Design a protein around this nucleic acid. Structure first.
Ligand code: NA
Ligand code: NA
Length: 327
DNA sequence: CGGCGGTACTG
DNA sequence: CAGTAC
DNA sequence: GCCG
């Protein structure tokens, strides 16, 4: 598609990012939805009524849209706190969100050097600070492929039958990727067990993993690593790498979840809800059991889904290719 | 108005 | 319980 | 912020 409302969405994005770094996440979310709708719209917007006809745009958003349309400017931008660019700087540090960014700003910090010299830093934030510039850039998908191959080769050394796939924006076919998520399972349903620890050990020993952000997260039968890798060779940057090992029966739903996008996942959860189902990285399930007072007592029952297509089918949806899952 | 996932780790 | 990122 |  093509954006016919550029000067409008450019302005809205400024406002959206301001709300985000100030921690108004719900308001930012609503802006994101409206901003999407505007770009993928058959025409430039020429009236308030037309703006409101668009799902995701109500009175308040339409008002701003038409103000921009007519005057070329959005006044609310002129009343945006001067702190916003610094809050964004601080929250670009992996492990620091808006609360930490506020705290540092109130302490009078203004720069990364300020943070590096005088800020108290969590173990994760120190790594995120140390690799600030590397983590901010998106890598070419070619480099993501090499990263996936590195993980896959070290995994298949333990069991050649392991199935390994890079998810996220890479699987959605983007030219560049902010990170790499490598999802690992085994078709025999059992031989994924034991792999996670040995795999991280092997990647450690050969120098590929340079820092761990979360060395192990256990979520049901899924194991997740969040860390930092760097391919061999000179001129290589540090990159964010996640590794998730899952049982074969959850592979389709894990695959879907880690392929995303985040916005696509949110809309699929909403759709499942309408059908009295829930959708997680583990399973498509019937909705949980709620008692007399409306509180969840027990989990629902899993609807088995061997493949991503099975998930879409049970939801009464046409299959969507990963490249079509940005929204 | 409340929901817009729920979750693990960590403190 | 709250902060963060998935 | 928007939606029901
Ligand atoms: Na609307
Ligand atoms: Na951050």
């Amino acid at each position: 598609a093509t954006n016919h409302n550029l000067h409008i969405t450019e302005k809205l994005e400024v406002l959206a990012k301001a709300y985000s770094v100030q921690g108004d996440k719900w308001r930012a979310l609503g802006y994101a939805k409206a901003i999407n709708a505007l770009k993928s719209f058959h025409k430039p917007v020429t009236s308030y009524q037309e703006a409101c006809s668009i799902p995701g745009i109500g009175k308040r958003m339409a008002e701003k849209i038409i103000e921009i349309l007519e005057s070329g400017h959005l006044r609310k931008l002129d009343h945006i706190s001067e702190s916003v660019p610094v809050l964004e700087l601080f929250s670009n540090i992996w492990g620091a969100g808006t609360k930490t960014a506020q705290m540092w700003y109130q302490q009078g910090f203004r720069s990364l050097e300020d943070i590096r010299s005088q800020a108290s830093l969590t173990t994760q934030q120190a790594i995120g600070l140390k690799h600030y510039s590397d983590f901010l850039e998106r890598m070419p998908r070619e480099e993501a492929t090499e990263i996936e191959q590195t993980v896959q080769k070290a995994a298949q050394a333990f069991n050649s039958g392991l199935l390994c796939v890079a998810c996220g924006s890479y699987r959605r076919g983007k030219a560049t990727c902010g990170d790499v998520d490598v999802l690992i399972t085994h078709p025999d349903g059992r031989s994924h067990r034991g792999i996670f620890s040995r795999l991280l050990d092997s990647l450690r020993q050969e120098g590929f993993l340079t820092d761990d952000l979360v060395s192990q997260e256990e979520n049901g039968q899924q194991q997740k690593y969040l860390g930092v890798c760097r391919l061999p060779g000179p001129g290589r940057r540090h990159r964010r790498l996640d590794i998730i090992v899952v049982p074969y029966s959850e592979f389709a739903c894990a695959l879907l979840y880690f392929t995303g996008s985040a916005h696509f996942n949110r809309s699929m959860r909403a759709l499942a809800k309408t059908k009295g189902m829930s959708l997680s990285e583990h399973a498509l399930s019937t909705a949980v059991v709620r008692n007399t007072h409306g509180c969840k007592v027990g989990p629902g029952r899993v609807l088995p889904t061997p493949t991503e297509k099975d998930v879409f089918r049970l939801l009464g949806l046409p299959y969507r290719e990963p490249a079509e899952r940005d929204w």
